[PDB]
Structures are given as C-alpha cells and as structure tokens.
C-alpha cells in the first residue's frame, strides 16, 4: 500500500520561501524509475503540475515556476522536498505530492511502460495560504435589501480561516447559505452568510447571525432586520 | 504544464446515466494520458492510465479510449460518488499537464436565480469602506454571470464572488458577489446596479438602488 502525506507551513507571507515535505511509504525512491511529483490546486481552480523527481535523481520543473522551485529527495528518509522561493498570494493553493510508477520490469527488464502514464497515488494535500496579514477578527455587517425575502451578514476582513457562522444560535438552517470566503487583495478574508425567508416571516421571526472566529477570539451575534 | 482541453467543462447528469468526457490535446501525446476523479474536498483519484487501462480497484463502470490528440472517459452508469470533477493529464511531454477539468453535477430543471442587492450598512460606512453585495439564490445550472454597474459604469477588478456547492436536496446553487469601494467613492455615485445573466432568465435581470435615496 502506497501512502504519501504532505507537510509544511499552512501560512506563509509574500516573498518568503515555502518548503513542502512529502513523506511517503509503500515504495522507495531507489526503486527503478519511480517518480514523486508535486501538483498544486488553487482553490476553485484546475490542477497544476509543479515538478517531479525520479529515483535516478532526474528532475523536471514547471517552466513557469522553474526559477522558484527546487525539488530534492531524501531517499533514506522516504521524503521529497519542494522549495518554492518568493511566494506571492497567487501561490495560495492546495499542494499535493503524488507517486508516479516506474516501468514494469521482469527479471530486471522493463517490459511495460504503460503504468508510468499516470500519477497513481496522491497525498491528501496541504493547503497553503500566502498572505502578509496577522490574525484579525472580522467586522460583521448586516445585509438587509434596500427594498421571497433575503437577509444576511457580511463577515468582513478576518484572518485566518476559518470562521463559523450560524443563524439564531443554530435554530435557523433552512434557506441559509454561508458562502465560501474570498481572500481579498488585502490578504484578509471576507464572506457572506444569507438566509431566504417567505417575507411574511419578516415581522414574525427575528434573525441574528452568530459569528465565531476562534483564531482571534472574536464572537459576535448580529441581529439583522428589514430596512427602513 | 501543457495544453489539454476537456469538454464539456460542465456536465449535468443523473444516477444511472451514461456520460462521456473528452480531452483534446494541442499535439499528439500517444497514449500517455490519465483520467482522474476529484471529489469535493479530496485529492484526485486515478481512474484510467495510459489512456485506456483501468487502475486496479477502480470500478469497471469507468473506461477510457483514444490516442494522439483525442481521448474520452466514459462512465457507463453514473453513481452518486461520480458527481465530481474529472481531469485528464498528459504525461508524454514536460511539463505534464492537466485539462481544465470537467464538473459533473446533479441535473434538474432550470431555475432562475432570485436576485437581491444589499447596500452597505451605515455601520460599515463609518469605517471608510462600502461593500455592496449581490445574492443569486437557488439557481441552476451553475453558470451565471454577474455584472456590477455604478451609475452605468461597468465595474471591473473591484468585486469578488463565491458560489455554494450544489445543494444536496435542491440541486441548485447560490452565488454571492461583493463590490467593494471606499466610502468616499461610494458617496460619489448614486445608482448601484447588479446585472444578472442566467440561462433561466429570458433577459438579464437588474437589481439596483439609489444610494442615499431614503
């Protein structure tokens, strides 16, 4: 059974150097033709190949990141290290290391290269955020339309993830939509949570969003109600 | 990594259905092509390697074929865990490359989004920032376009949006887009409009408000 697991900093600041380590078992980087590669995946986007290193120490890098990447292996420790220098916010992504099989051999002779045409096992991946911001609790603002009905809370400028958001201490779940947070250019996160109601219920029930940002010890309950 | 175009980029389907995903490469990659399935919050999982070989442990419903510049992944009978994103990867040339991915979600009848626009709170304004949020609630399909306009000026570079995962019993999506401006700039305009385009909408629906108009 092959397993790989990535480790490294979950948070790095721009211009700093990012060192990711892939610890694996079930195979050796001294095994013929075996490769261990790195793939990253920016939140919401497609997979992106970064580099691969083989048993014979042959190495290849994404041409786009070549100047910032160094991949190395430590055969004895079953590890592969990927170093990315001068990271920037666009490097925030989930980084995966993955195993590439070497050609099938029979009594020492490669008889089938078919299996090398894939990355057959991947690590769970490590999420890395590049931001220069320090821990910071969000500001919670009400969302009430100026004029069937919708209301919500804007949880703005916090860091880092995650933040918990519930409505009416957890009683209201129906019609609720807590959106994934977006990482603003400021390096802080922002998200919105909204609830859709029958309008009629605008005079009947009260709506308070409960926000908890554990990282900064920021708990806030904001009762949100209709406009004018 | 290298140029591989997957089609369609998005595909609606239902359990039991038969689907196919295609991957076309800018140049021949012989049979050095792999297909992966990535479930939400999980790492990609190898399905097919060397264009048509089935990875051990992978269910027989999956099959791939093609060579050179045209490859297909077909799932004979779509199962619940197959509602995921699929990627192809070419390993004939360095850098190895992935396709843009093909999202496979639960099909349902088109549903226009309920659109709402929320002006910034006086609370936020006292802070010096104005966030204007636009909500597109419970719609389908997932593709929707949101355009912000401030006094007829199309806004660009000053908004971000996020979409929810497909609702487990609605099969619909919801989108939130936030337009961010300084209080100063916010105060220099009157009409804040959120224009929405979606298959379920005959014509674009616009929701707006006049700042200050109380």
């Amino acid at each position: 059974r092959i397993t790989l697991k990535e480790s490294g900093p979950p948070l790095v600041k721009p211009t700093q150097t990012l060192t990711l380590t892939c610890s694996f078992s079930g195979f050796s980087l001294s095994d013929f033709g075996v490769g261990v590669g790195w793939i990253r995946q920016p939140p919401g986007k497609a997979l992106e190949w970064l580099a691969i290193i083989y048993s014979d120490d042959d190495k290849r890098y994404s041409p786009s990141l070549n100047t910032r990447l160094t991949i190395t292996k430590d055969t004895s420790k079953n590890q592969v290290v990927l170093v990315m220098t001068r990271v920037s916010p666009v490097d925030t992504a989930t980084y995966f290391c993955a195993h590439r099989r070497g050609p099938t051999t029979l009594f020492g002779v490669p008889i089938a290269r078919g299996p090398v045409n894939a990355m057959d096992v991947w690590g769970q991946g490590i999420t890395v955020t590049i931001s220069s911001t320090s821990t910071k609790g969000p500001s919670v603002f009400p969302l009430a339309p100026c004029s069937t009905a919708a209301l919500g809370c804007l949880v703005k400028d916090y860091f880092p993830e995650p933040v918990t958001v519930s409505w009416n201490s957890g009683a209201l779940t129906s019609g609720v939509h807590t959106f994934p947070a977006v990482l603003q250019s400021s390096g802080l996160y922002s998200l919105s949570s909204v609830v859709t109601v029958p309008s009629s219920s605008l005079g009947t029930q009260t709506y308070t969003c409960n926000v908890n940002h554990k990282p900064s010890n920021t708990k806030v309950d904001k009762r949100v109600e209709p406009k004018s | 990594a290298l140029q591989l175009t997957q089609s369609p980029s998005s595909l609606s389907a239902s359990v039991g259905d038969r689907i196919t995903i295609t991957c076309r490469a800018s140049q021949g990659v012989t049979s050095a092509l792999a297909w992966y399935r990535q479930k939400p919050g999980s790492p990609p999982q190898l399905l097919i390697y060397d264009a048509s070989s089935l990875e051990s442990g992978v269910p027989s419903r999956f099959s791939g074929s093609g060579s050179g510049t045209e490859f297909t992944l077909t799932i004979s009978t779509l199962r619940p865990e197959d509602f995921a994103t699929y990627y192809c990867q070419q390993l004939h040339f360095y850098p190895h490359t992935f396709g843009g991915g093909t999202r496979v979600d639960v099909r349902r009848t088109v549903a226009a989004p309920s659109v709402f626009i929320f002006p910034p709170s006086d609370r936020q304004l006292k802070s010096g920032t104005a966030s204007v949020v636009c909500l597109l609630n419970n719609f389908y399909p997932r593709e929707a376009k949101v355009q912000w306009k401030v006094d007829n000026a199309l806004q660009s570079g000053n908004s971000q949006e996020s979409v929810t995962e497909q609702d487990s019993k609605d099969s619909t999506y919801s989108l939130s887009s936030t337009l961010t401006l300084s209080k100063a700039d916010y105060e220099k305009h009157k009409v804040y409009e959120c224009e929405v385009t979606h298959q379920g909408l005959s014509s674009p629906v616009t929701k707006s408000f006049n700042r200050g108009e109380c």
Binding site: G35, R60, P103, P110, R113 | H92, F93, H96
Partner: peptide, 9 residues
C-alpha cells in the same frame, strides 16, 4: 516541446 522520461523505452 520537452519529451517525457519514458517517451520511448
């Protein structure tokens, strides 16, 4: 442009 490690074996 660049051929893979195992482009012909």
């Amino acid at each position: 442009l660049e051929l893979d490690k195992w482009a012909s074996l």
